[PDB]
Design goal:
The structure is cut from a larger assembly and holds two copies of chain A and one copy of chain B (29 residues). Chain A is α/β, with parallel strands linked by helices and 259 residues long. Chain A has helices at 3-18, 32-42, 62-72, 85-95, 106-111, 113-117, 138-144, 163-173, 181-186, 189-198, 228-238, 242-249; strands at residues 53-56, 101-104, 123-125, 151-152, 218-224. Chain A contains twelve helices and five strands. In chain A, strands 2-1-3-4 form a four-stranded parallel sheet. In chain A, helix 1 packs across helix 2. Chain A is globular and about 70 Å long. Chain B is rod-shaped. In chain B, 3% of the residues are buried. Classes of the chains: A alpha/beta (259), B mainly alpha (29). Chains in contact: A-B, A-C. The interface between A and C is large, with 50 and 48 residues. Strand 5 of chain A pairs parallel with strand 5 (101-107) of chain C, so a sheet runs across the interface. The structure holds adenosine-5'-diphosphate and beryllium trifluoride ion (BEF). Adenosine-5'-diphosphate (ADP) sits between chains A (1-2, 26-34, 156) and C (65, 93-95). Chain B: Residues 6-29 form a coiled coil. Chain B: Component of the chromatin remodeling INO80 complex; specifically part of a complex module associated with the helicase ATP-binding and the helicase C-terminal domain of INO80. Interacts with RP9.
Chain lengths: 259, 29, 131
C-alpha cells in the first residue's frame, strides 16, 4: 500500500473497534478504492469476511470498481447487480455463501430495495455519496432504512453546498447527536466548533501531503465574443435562463438555418 | 426413492451455478 | 484533449462538426449504456487512435480514471462548483504523468459572468470552510 493509505486503514480499523462510523474524504486520484480494499482485507477475524459487502456505487463506476476487485486481491469474489431484469433476477436468486462483495447503482438499490431487505449485510460502503445531500429524496430514506451495524463512506469533494447537505451528511453518519435541522444551524466561533466536532470521525489529505511528484495543473480562462446573429438574438431576448444560455452558447437551437 | 429427487436437486443447483457463472463472464466484459 | 459539455443538443452539434472535420469522435454520455461506457473506457487506455473524447460532467467525469489525456477543455460553465472539479481531477489523478492543463471557454461577460462569479464565491467558501 502507501503510508497515508496504511494510516487511514489503521484509523478505520480503530473506528470499527470503537464502533464509530465516519467518512473517508480524500482528493481524487489518491487511492480511495485502494484504501477501501485494504480496509476490507484488514478484516481477518472472520466477522465481516463471512458476510457480504454491499458496495453502493454510482452506475458509471461499476466496471472500474469491478476490475479493482478482480485485480487487487485474487480472493474477494464479486457478484455484480446491474443489467437486464433477467440477469439481475438470476443473480438475486443465486444467493437467495460466496456473495463476498456486491456492486449496484443508486437507482437499482432503491427500486429493488425489497430484494436487499431480505438479505442480511455484514458491511456497507456507499462510494461517491456526494449525491446523498437532499434528505427529502427517496434515496436518503431508502438508504437510512437499511439495517446495518456499520456504515462506511469514501465520498470525495464533500459539502460545498448549503447547510441542508451538512444536516443530511451528519444525520446519516449517526441518527443520534443530531435531532433537527434548525438545531444544527444553531450549533469564527461557529466554524471552529464545527471543525472540532468533525475532527475525530473524519480524515483529509489534500494534494500536498500525498502528491510527491504531480505538476500543478494550469487553469486558463478564455473569453469569447458573440457573433452578429448571436447579437441580433441577444437584442431580441433583452427587448428566461435556459433559453438565454442556449441562445448564447449557440443560435442553431432556436433557429436552424434554412435552405 | 427420495435419492432421485435429491440428486435432481443438486443437478439443478449446479445448472443454476453454471448459468450464474455464464452471466458473470458475460458481465466481465 | 478531453472535452466536457452539458447539453446533449450541444454535444450533437459538436459531433456534427467533429464529423465535418476529421479529428475522430468518441463519446460516452448518459444515454450510452453501461457496457458501452466500460468498453470505451477500456479502449481509451491501451488504445491511441481516439484523439479526443467527449464527455458530460455527471455522466463521465465522476469515477472514470481518464489519466491518458493531458488537457481538459470545458466548453461550458456549471452553476454548482465542485462538479468541473471531479472532471479536472479525473484527468489530473495519479497516472497523468505527461501534463495537466484545464482551459475554460467562457463568454465576454454576457450572462456567463454571473455564473463564474457565483462559482468563484462558492469555491472560496468550500475552500475555507474545512481547510
Ligand atoms: N498502491 C498503488 N499502486 C498502483 N496504483 C495505485 C495505488 N494506489 C492507488 N493507485 C491508483 O489510483 C487510481 C484509483 O484511485 P481512485 O480510487 O479513483 O482515487 P479517488 O478515490 O481519489 O478518485 C488507480 O488508477 C490506481 O492506478
Ligand atoms: F476521482 Be474518483 F474516480 F471518484
Amino acid at each position: 500500500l502507501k503510508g497515508y493509505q496504511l494510516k487511514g486503514m489503521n484509523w478505520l480499523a480503530n473506528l470499527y473497534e470503537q464502533g464509530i462510523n465516519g467518512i473517508l474524504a480524500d482528493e481524487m486520484g489518491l487511492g480511495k478504492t485502494v484504501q477501501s480494499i485494504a480496509l476490507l482485507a484488514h478484516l481477518a477475524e472472520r466477522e465481516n469476511i463471512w458476510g457480504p459487502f454491499l458496495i453502493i456505487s454510482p452506475a458509471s463506476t461499476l466496471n472500474n470498481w469491478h476490475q479493482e476487485f478482480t485485480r487487487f486481491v485474487p480472493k474477494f469474489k464479486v457478484l455484480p447487480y446491474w443489467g437486464n431484469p433477467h440477469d439481475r433476477k438470476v443473480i438475486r436468486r443465486f444467493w437467495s455463501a460466496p456473495f463476498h462483495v456486491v456492486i449496484t447503482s443508486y437507482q437499482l438499490v432503491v427500486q429493488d430495495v425489497k430484494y436487499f431487505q431480505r438479505v442480511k449485510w455484514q458491511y456497507m460502503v456507499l462510494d461517491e455519496a456526494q449525491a446523498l445531500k437532499s434528505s427529502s429524496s427517496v434515496r436518503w430514506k431508502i438508504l437510512l432504512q437499511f439495517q446495518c451495524r456499520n456504515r462506511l463512506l469514501l465520498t470525495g469533494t464533500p459539502i460545498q453546498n448549503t447547510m441542508a447537505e451538512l444536516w443530511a451528511l451528519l444525520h446519516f453518519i449517526m441518527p443520534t447527536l443530531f435531532d433537527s435541522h434548525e438545531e444544527f444551524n444553531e450549533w469564527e466561533n461557529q466554524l471552529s466548533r464545527l471543525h472540532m466536532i468533525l475532527k475525530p470521525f473524519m480524515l483529509r489529505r489534500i494534494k500536498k501531503d500525498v502528491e510527491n511528484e504531480l505538476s500543478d495543473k494550469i487553469e486558463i480562462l478564455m473569453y469569447c465574443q458573440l457573433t452578429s446573429r448571436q447579437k441580433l438574438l441577444y437584442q431580441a431576448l433583452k427587448n428566461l435562463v435556459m433559453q438565454f444560455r442556449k441562445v448564447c452558447n449557440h443560435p442553431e437551437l432556436f433557429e436552424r438555418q434554412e435552405t | 426413492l427420495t435419492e432421485e429427487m435429491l440428486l435432481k436437486r443438486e443437478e439443478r443447483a449446479r445448472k443454476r451455478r453454471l448459468q450464474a457463472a455464464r452471466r458473470a463472464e458475460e458481465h466481465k466484459n | 484533449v478531453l472535452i466536457y459539455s452539458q447539453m446533449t443538443r450541444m454535444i450533437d452539434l459538436l459531433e456534427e462538426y467533429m464529423v465535418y472535420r476529421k479529428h475522430t469522435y468518441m463519446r460516452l454520455d448518459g444515454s450510452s449504456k453501461i457496457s458501452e461506457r466500460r468498453d470505451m473506457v477500456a479502449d481509451f487506455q491501451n488504445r491511441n487512435d481516439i484523439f479526443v473524447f467527449l464527455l458530460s460532467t455527471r455522466a463521465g467525469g465522476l469515477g472514470i480514471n481518464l489519466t491518458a489525456a493531458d488537457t481538459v477543455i470545458f466548453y461550458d460553465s456549471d452553476w454548482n462548483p465542485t462538479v468541473d472539479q471531479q472532471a479536472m481531477d479525473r484527468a489530473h489523478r495519479l497516472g497523468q504523468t505527461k501534463q495537466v492543463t484545464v482551459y475554460r471557454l467562457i463568454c465576454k461577460g454576457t450572462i456567463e459572468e454571473r455564473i463564474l462569479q457565483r462559482a468563484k464565491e462558492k469555491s472560496e467558501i468550500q475552500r475555507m470552510v474545512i481547510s
